[PDB]
Design a protein around this ligand. Structure first.
Ligand SMILES: *P(=O)(O)OC[C@H]1O[C@@H](n2cnc3c(N)ncnc32)[C@H](O)[C@@H]1O
Length: 258
């Protein structure tokens, strides 16, 4: 089937006015688009949602996450992949909504409509993701910590004045504590001081063609036995610094030896 006409998120940017954004918990589920009569996956597959699961839903199109609870991704994914419209396991799933993709008004009014839709439907299977205002970035990062320590995935931000767009949107942003990506180890940088005779850092070249140093994230065993040159490794970072270098980059682990 054709992929559904959905809005996609960009990455958090430091220089926003956080007071203009609604903040919600980023849920680790399976995205579904409700077109008014069926649920559709990001790839265009029609989910075999049982009749009793969707029976109460309004015909307003809705965007949401099929989700059970924090840290139950494989469970919800396993159910949603099952081709069986009489599968009782859907009873533990909630369609957690976060937008109205056919709406032509601002996100603030869309939230108000969603609250009404959820309340009127009054079904265990349809619920609204909480949307809150946060006063400043320090408070936002404190909230991020609360959510992550509680085994949540992160936060999402959506500008109160945003109009729905069927593409990546700068008005919709993901905020996680960090990002991971891959790079190839190309050289060693011998250490000094406590790391004399050991690994000080590696030089890697990432998939965007940027070469940079990684000196943190190594165990003491890894400073004695470094990743092989040529290996594909995963590094962790958040945002970019000058010259498109991943910021606060640290070593995670080896993926492939070349
Ligand atoms: P991650 O990088 O896995 O991105 C999360 C995706 O799921 C959708 N999503 C989850 N939770 C929400 C909220 N609260 N609001 C909006 N969208 C959500 C996002 O589109 C991401 O694609």
């Amino acid at each position: 089937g054709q992929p559904p006409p959905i809005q996609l998120a960009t990455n958090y940017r430091q220089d926003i006015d956080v007071t203009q954004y609604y903040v919600s918990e980023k849920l680790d589920g399976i995205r579904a688009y409700w077109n008014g009569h069926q649920l559709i996956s990001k790839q265009g597959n029609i989910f075999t949602a049982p009749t009793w699961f969707i029976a109460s839903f309004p015909t307003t199109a809705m965007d949401g996450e099929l989700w059970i609870a924090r840290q139950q991704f494989e469970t919800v994914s396993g159910i949603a992949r099952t081709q069986d419209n009489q599968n009782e396991q859907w009873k533990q799933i909630k369609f957690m909504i976060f937008d109205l993709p056919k709406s032509t008004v601002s996100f603030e009014q869309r939230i108000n409509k969603m609250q009404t839709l959820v309340t009127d439907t009054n079904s265990p299977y349809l619920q609204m993701i909480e949307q809150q205002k946060i006063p400043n970035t320090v408070a936002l990062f404190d909230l991020l910590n609360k959510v992550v320590m509680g085994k949540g995935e992160g936060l999402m931000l959506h500008h109160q004045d945003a109009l729905y767009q069927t593409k990546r949107s700068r008005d919709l942003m993901k905020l996680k504590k960090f990002e991971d990506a891959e790079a190839t180890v190309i050289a060693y940088l011998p250490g000094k001081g406590k790391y004399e005779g050991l690994l000080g850092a590696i030089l890697v070249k990432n998939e965007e063609g940027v070469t940079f140093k990684i000196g943190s994230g190594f165990s003491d065993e890894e400073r004695s036995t470094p990743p092989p040159i040529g290996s594909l490794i995963t590094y962790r970072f958040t945002g970019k610094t000058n010259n498109n270098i991943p910021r606060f980059a640290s070593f995670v682990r080896i993926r492939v030896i070349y």
